Amino acid sequence: MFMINILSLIIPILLAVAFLTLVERKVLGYMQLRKGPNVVGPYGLLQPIADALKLFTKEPLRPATSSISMFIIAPILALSLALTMWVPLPMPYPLINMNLGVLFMLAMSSLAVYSILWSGWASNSKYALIGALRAVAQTISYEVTLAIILLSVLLMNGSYTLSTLITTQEHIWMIFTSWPLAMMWFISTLAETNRAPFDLTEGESELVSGFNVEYAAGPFAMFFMAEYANIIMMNAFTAILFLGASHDPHTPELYTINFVLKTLALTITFLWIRASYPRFRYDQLMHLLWKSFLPLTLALCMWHISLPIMTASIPPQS
Amino acid sequence: PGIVELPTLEDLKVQEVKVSSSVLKAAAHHYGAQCDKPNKEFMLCRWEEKDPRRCLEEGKLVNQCALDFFRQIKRHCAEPFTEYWTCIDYSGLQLFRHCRKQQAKFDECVLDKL
Amino acid sequence: MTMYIAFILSTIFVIGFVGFSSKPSPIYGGLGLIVSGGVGCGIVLNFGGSFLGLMVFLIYLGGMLVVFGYTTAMATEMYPEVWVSNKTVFGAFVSGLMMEFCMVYYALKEEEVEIIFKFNGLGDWVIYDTGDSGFFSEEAMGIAALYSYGTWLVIVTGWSLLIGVVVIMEITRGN
Amino acid sequence: MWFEILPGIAVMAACLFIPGMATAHIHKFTNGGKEKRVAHFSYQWNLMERDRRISGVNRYHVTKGLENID
Amino acid sequence: MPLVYMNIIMAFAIALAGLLMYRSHLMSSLLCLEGMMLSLFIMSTLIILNTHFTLANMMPIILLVFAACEAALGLSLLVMVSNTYGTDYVQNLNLLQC
Amino acid sequence: AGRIASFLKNAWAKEPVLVASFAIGGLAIILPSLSPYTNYAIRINRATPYNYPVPLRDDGNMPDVPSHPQDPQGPSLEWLKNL
Amino acid sequence: MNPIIYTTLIMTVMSGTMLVMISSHWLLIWIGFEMNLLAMIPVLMKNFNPRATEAATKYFLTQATASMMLMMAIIINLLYSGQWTITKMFNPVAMTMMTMALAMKLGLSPFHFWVPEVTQGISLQAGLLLLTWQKLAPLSVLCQISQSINPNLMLTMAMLSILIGGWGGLNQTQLRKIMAYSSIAHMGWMTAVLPYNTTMTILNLLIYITMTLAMFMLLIHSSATTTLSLSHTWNKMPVITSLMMVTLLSMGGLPPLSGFMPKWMIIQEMTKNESIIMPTLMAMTALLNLYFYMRLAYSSSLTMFPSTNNMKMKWQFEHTKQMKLLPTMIVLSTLVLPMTPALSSLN
Amino acid sequence: GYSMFAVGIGTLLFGYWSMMKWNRERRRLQIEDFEARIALMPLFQAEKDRRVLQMLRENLEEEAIIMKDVPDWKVGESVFHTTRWVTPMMGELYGLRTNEEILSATYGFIWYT
Amino acid sequence: MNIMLTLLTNVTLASLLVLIAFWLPQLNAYSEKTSPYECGFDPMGSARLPFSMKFFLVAITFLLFDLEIALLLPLPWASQTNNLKTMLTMALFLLILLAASLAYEWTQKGLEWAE
Amino acid sequence: PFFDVQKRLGLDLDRWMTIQSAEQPHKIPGRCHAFEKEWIECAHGIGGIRAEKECKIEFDDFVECLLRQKTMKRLSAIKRQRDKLIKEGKYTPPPHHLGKEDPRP
Ligand SMILES: CCCCCCCCCCCCCCCCC[C@@H](O)O[C@H](CO[C@H](O)CCCCCCCCCCCCCCC)COP(=O)(O)OCC[N+](C)(C)C
């Protein structure tokens, strides 16, 4: 019966990714004084199906100078990790209940970067190499600040279990307690998902197509799905972490609906941000994270260590 | 270096308490308030002898006292107790916080009956 | 030996160690070390060390990333080597695999001492403790106890880290 | 329209509803309709094992009440 | 000793033998050193978890810390070597004889 | 008073992030020692019953030890219930 | 390097040695070794000098391998006995890891190949620190596990160290390599008696430290790194050459100079344990060290080598910087034999 | 300028106070749960003792059954010089039993999510 | 067991997707189609040449800093100790040293990239 | 060599971690707490030379608690004899070792 649950977690996420591609185009079109896809199907509803069918019926290319084994492995790893992201998330009941869910998600997110690294290296192309090195720089920029941000925000939860976050925020949202962190966390997610203004590993204005310039058809499609699935998963994680919905043990549908609405709002927020700002330089992102976010993150970590002790409000779980 | 003595299977027989964890958690506070003496006797023996074989009789007394407690609850009022432990059982973490109304009803019944 | 899970994970651990120990392009050495780190995380998790395994896995996926960054810059070669592109790399890889296989076969079918002592087998489930108590994790409290008990360890570790930063700054000065 | 983006967002919401709702329904169905038990620590697992042993059917969710005290 | 202990010990032995043999690259030997630290971490963690030594649960973490500095130290040396020769080949480290 | 004020004004003009970080860090260092609730936090941590309280064997001269949990002797958590 | 950073690194090296020498936990001893090596690596590279980079790289590689073996020995000893204290060190295989790692840290043959290269590649002050202070921690660790040391392995390594130091010193024109090979020979002498009496090990270590401090300070005073450079000192500072010649005679082990005191007592110890062949072999082998000390004495003080014209200008200037401990080191390195019984204060 | 900082600080203070109340309540609830467990412990201890002793007794009886004619085998011989009770190894308990419950006893808690 | 099944299913789905991608469409690969892309002209060198990295020092600093989050992580569990003052002092001391390391590298121009 | 400043100053820098019988958090005991306690109390002040010989019984018990080699050998003997009896068909293991045991609380 667990296989049915795995499939029910996998297939709807892929469909939601396929239609997020449609939503992004329409959101950008209407924000740029145009319409977007509205011809293929009613209101463009059939556009994702056409795109997928065209992508998987087109020939995939094998570069002559490429290392084929790692070239093939990289998109598989990216997509598999993107799908594996979702199993510990409580909606309100996680598929896998872990005592350490935040740590698992953080480690696997760390693992996701290699797909891009090995795609850039295995393509044996100069632009792919530049994109891979930009990915290295981005990860070095963001992981430390993101980790201390999680630690500071979870000091008021008491543990790394994601199901305890619902109990922590039963009366108020976490964003009313740690809004200065949430902002930074938001920006960190934009860097972790390689999204504007931090779309540097796949920068089309400089690197033609970045790390996946040599990819085509199915492997490119899998990379694209991994990107959008990671976007949705990170927005869901932000919603659960900072916007705690109420849960009825006899009626979890209300929690599911509210959580989905918040996740959609955050995803639309990313789509809105992409159409509003220019792109950074990959050294400017590192300087922003190290010279601005790191000192504030350390100070707020000290503050959130001290505050429960000062106010006698330490969370329960040992 | 020596034969380890073990009690016979007749020595380990006892009238078991076959209620689930939900029932036990629902009745735990009154069980600890009522059956305190035999339980403390058994635990003092357990930590003093450091050997399960020495005072199985204390465990038998523990089961007998627990069974007397549950029999008293069953004879006096089981409807509030059932309505309490059903709600306790529904929760996946078996939360006391989930339903204080049934707990209040059970407390009132036990206070006015015993 | 039930489900052979710990034994299989340990075998994959040694296979990854042989993979990065044959000294191929630092890219594939890093790949093998990532594989061994992941399977070591699995091995530690199977014994109840969830935090330690995740932490080691988390630590390794970072250090390896930095190494990938350094290899692209200074360990690069016009033609990078894989385990079958060179005579000596393949020789070392095959030698490691065969040593793994022969030691496993001798220790499983027979009971032979290699260096320290011998083994019987029957799986790693026998050595367990059947401990039944607690609303906490023993590993979490042990790790958690460093601040309360290991004040001296915290002091020496923090001093070592600050000194290490200073050391890196001074070494990479050049001039 | 600007409200023509709504059909795609609605399809997204319909797709994202399925994971959590199906997980909750499967948890109720497999564990007798009462919110599958969570065992974060060894004490809770021991409680589940005791329930499974005393259930007489090898299912932990089958609960025995006061009707087992005779 | 279970088979897992022997597997971890032989992994450490393989990493040590890999370090003691140099092909051409210093980076490969640094990777072997880091593999030795990983094997030691796994072995000590298994030993501590098996015997329920609670207060020792913190020593693997400390171990990892003193891996990183060491690893960091090595990386620093490597870049200097590169800056002198343009390659990380151990052959170029031959100005000093016995 | 006249030099540090000008320096702080210039730092706030140029580096507001650093000023905020140092202010928050200094507050987090200083205030815990000047708080009356830290002792309450330590007491709450001490009051959590993680393990079984093993009873003591009666020798006959332990007036401060209760014979029953509901006896008037022993520690009281009424300070916690109104906190 | 900034002077404050230099002093911080020196204090960190000394704190690593002290943490090794005061800890009762194996993990803390390993941590002390780690921090000592971490702070030592920059000191070898105070000046850039790609030779110094090579020396630091080789030192780091050898010490990292030795630390790896150290930690594996500790872990195996923990596995076979749930103990963390520095004690009888129950397992024998873990004891062999212990001995090999500590020998590689000390530079005992056959794990001595690094010492001449590392000493030659760095400056004289760094060589002084490396050849004097870096022997304290491994010897202190060995002194506590001496009851569990296999006499065969330790004794064969000590004999090999003495032989290899004596042989390799004969081919050297560079003074730093001569000092390195002398260090190897004296490490062998110290470790040959450690299974029998640790007091003699401490005595030999103290005498060696005094002599090497005096010699390195004299080599810094007359800024010479080769034999031919030292052959010019007589035309500028004859007193330095005379003191160096007497110090070399003391190092050779000739009585009544203090360098005779350790070896003598070591022999005096080893005969009590019915060991006759080994003391004879070590005493006969030290004549190689004496020979290549006397060659330096010939080249530096007992004969006058040709000089240069520019040396005249050097006659007009003084040695501005002063070594305060140099006279005391010289006197202790030569004239302390009549005070031999004072070694009873060591135990 | 001042207004935005003021409203941010006000929201932070309100959130801190709300979380302080909620966390104190949560600590009280955790204490109550721990007390329920403590009250239930002695019964579980007694059942654990009886279950372990019964399984050891069955293991001993079968060990006698298998070991009919082994020349110098003592039935029930210990491996410790000491005569005090030693906690069973769990390899001593489920050794002569089926593999499914061996997995349940060893990996049952770890693999349950 | 459930997590291993989940990982196996995810990897199997990805592998089936790549197999469908490589075996469904018609393939016509020749020499020039599979050549590297450098905007229309032939590349001069190879992508496997050394690639200078201007943030190596920041990379080593990240290596050192990533092992302090490991130390910092068990803080939620360390907050439950009875020695709250000692734990708070040590946590603040560790964070202060991390901040001091960052400040020292900042002031020594270590955060600026190579030219 | 070993400069015992901890004993002189009464400091306890690292003696809290040397053994598993020394004040673990939450009073969690080691798996061989009793054996190590007995071995330490046997050999407290007699010295290492006398301890290695006179307290060998407690040390042997402690080590076999740590590694369980003798228990593994005994269980392996039991298993192999049972297997050889089963292969020729003379044992017929009881139902409760086949998963048919009437479970008890
Ligand atoms: C060539 C001359 C060498 C001389 C060496 C330097 C001369 C200056 C002396 C340095 C002073 C440092 C120590 C003296 C006071 C410190 C007090 C305390 O720390 O020391 C006590 C004991 O004092 C020292 O141990 C002895 C100091 C005496 C040094 C002189 C001996 C020289 C050898 C004899 C040759 C003649 C020299 C004549 C000099 C003019 C500690 O005892 P203990 O902790 O339990 O022993 C540790 C060793 N263990 C591991 C075996 C237990």
Ligand SMILES: CCCCCCCCCCCCCCCCC[C@@H](O)O[C@H](CO[C@H](O)CCCCCCCCCCCCCCC)COP(=O)(O)OCC[N+](C)(C)C
């Ligand atoms: C989305 C995740 C779930 C998916 C679930 C299904 C899994 C899909 C598996 C992925 C492959 C499907 C792709 C669809 C077409 C298959 C392609 C291939 O298998 O067909 C040919 C296989 O034929 C080969 O020539 C092999 C023939 C014989 C050699 C060994 C086969 C022996 C089997 C015995 C057959 C006897 C009768 C069997 C029935 C009883 C290869 O042709 P080839 O030209 O290369 O490649 C181009 C294919 N084109 C033409 C469609 C563009």
Ligand SMILES: CCCCCCCCCCCCCCCCC[C@@H](O)O[C@H](CO[C@H](O)CCCCCCCCCCCCCCC)COP(=O)(O)OCC[N+](C)(C)C
């Ligand atoms: C003789 C000269 C001394 C000064 C020289 C300094 C150089 C040495 C480095 C520091 C040495 C001081 C020794 C402190 C060791 C800590 C242990 C002791 O202090 O007690 C602890 C007290 O720790 C307190 O937190 C105070 C010590 C913390 C010191 C703050 C920072 C000190 C760092 C300064 C030097 C470090 C390097 C330079 C940093 C810039 C434990 O208290 P408690 O919790 O009851 O007991 C726990 C055990 N239980 C659970 C069984 C009950």
Ligand SMILES: CCCCCCCC/C=C\CCCCCCCC(=O)O[C@H](COC(=O)CCCCCCC/C=C/CCCCCCCC)COP(=O)(O)OCCN
């Ligand atoms: C009373 C006790 C209270 C304790 C202390 C609490 C008070 C703290 C008061 C200050 C908190 C402010 C911190 C907020 C985050 C820091 C922001 C920051 O300082 O960084 C900016 C930089 O910020 C950016 O540039 C962001 C760029 C990316 C923009 C992306 C879209 C914009 C945001 C969209 C909406 C975000 C929504 C956030 C919440 C989402 C829900 C979780 C400064 O950078 P520079 O101006 O370049 O200075 C460096 C040169 N000297």
Ligand SMILES: CCCCCCCC/C=C\CCCCCCCC(=O)O[C@H](COC(=O)CCCCCCC/C=C/CCCCCCCC)COP(=O)(O)OCCN
């Ligand atoms: C021991 C206390 C610990 C607690 C607080 C610490 C928490 C974390 C904060 C520290 C993180 C690291 C800080 C690193 C500081 C380095 C500053 C620096 O060197 O940058 C200068 C610039 O920085 C400065 O301007 C100097 C310092 C500015 C002020 C710093 C704080 C001073 C005191 C403020 C707080 C006082 C107390 C709080 C009162 C607040 C009012 C209520 C150079 O700028 P560049 O980016 O390199 O290039 C610019 C030109 N292109």
